[PDB]
Amino acid sequence: EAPTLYLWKTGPWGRCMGDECGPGGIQTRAVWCAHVEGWTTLHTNCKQAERPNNQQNCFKVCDWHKELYDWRLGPWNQCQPVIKGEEGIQVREIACIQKDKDIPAEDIICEYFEPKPLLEQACLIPC
């Protein structure tokens, strides 16, 4: 279609910042424009319509949220080959759930309380 000279790049989200426990927090991240040849350039060289937000809403976590959220561990799926038994792996889904209303929430909430369990393990496929 059309060549690309400039693109937006983003750093990692900082910590959720708030006055109040719960919604209404703020994460900020670095956003800058770069030339495709790899150097930082003027922000006005990138298309502003494509400019990622340097801010997003977030949930300010406090100890008293512990009982309201938890990890839901989906079941291990098919043993996939890696290319007796032949080495393979299986994956599973893992989500943070607001327990009462039973709906998705951001991983970083459940993370504050318990580390995220693994999405992958080894498995053997029978000959």
Asked whether 69 and 99 are in contact (CB, 8 A), the reply is yes
- Say how many C-beta atoms besides its own lie within 10 A of residue 112's C-beta: 14
Q: How far apart are CA 85 and CA 90, in angstroms?
A: 15
* 26 three-state secondary structure: strand
For the chain, the structural domain boundaries read: 6-60, 63-125
Q: How far is CA 71 from the centre of its chain?
A: 14
Q: Which residue has the tokens 């350039």?
A: 41
Q: How far apart are CA 63 and CA 91, in angstroms?
A: 31
Question: Token pair for residue 25?
Answer: 């927090």
DSSP string, 68-109: TEEEEEPPP---EE----EEEEEE--EEEEETTTTEEE-HHH
Nearest Cα neighbor of 65 from 102, 116, 99 is 99
Asked how this structure was determined, the answer is: X-ray
